[PDB]
């Protein structure tokens, strides 16, 4: 199952290119609410809150890019 590994999230906004690895966690029975999880280049890990418009815009601008082919 693996429930939400982030009990709290990030409400303050920040520039995305700093994130070396932006990976969001999917939702399901393990966790009804979806949670984001970026990894700052300084070796930090901050879960983001999609309730804001910057977290969802930052994840969209960071995810929307060359993926394959």
From Swiss-Prot:
Which domain of life does the UniProt lineage start with? Answer: Eukaryota
State the disulfide connectivity.
4-31, 6-47
Q: What is the effect of changing residue 61 to A?
A: Decreases heparin-binding activity. Impairs heparin-binding activity and leukocyte transendothelial migration
Outcome of swapping residue 64 to A: Impairs heparin-binding activity and leukocyte transendothelial migration
Coiled coil ranges (UniProt) are none
Q: What is the effect of changing residue 65 to A?
A: Impairs heparin-binding activity and leukocyte transendothelial migration
In Swiss-Prot or TrEMBL terms, this protein is called IL-8(9-77)
**Which source organism does the UniProt entry give?**
Homo sapiens
The protein's gene is named: CXCL8
Q: Which residues of the full protein are shown?
A: 31 to 99 of 99
């Amino acid at each position: 199952e693996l429930r939400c590994q982030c009990i709290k999230t990030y409400s303050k906004p920040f520039h995305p290119k700093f994130i070396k690895e932006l990976r969001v966690i999917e939702s399901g029975p393990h966790c009804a609410n979806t949670e984001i999880i970026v990894k700052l280049s300084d070796g930090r890990e901050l879960c983001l809150d999609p309730k804001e418009n910057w977290v969802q815009r930052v994840v969209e601008k960071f995810l929307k890019r060359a993926e394959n082919s």
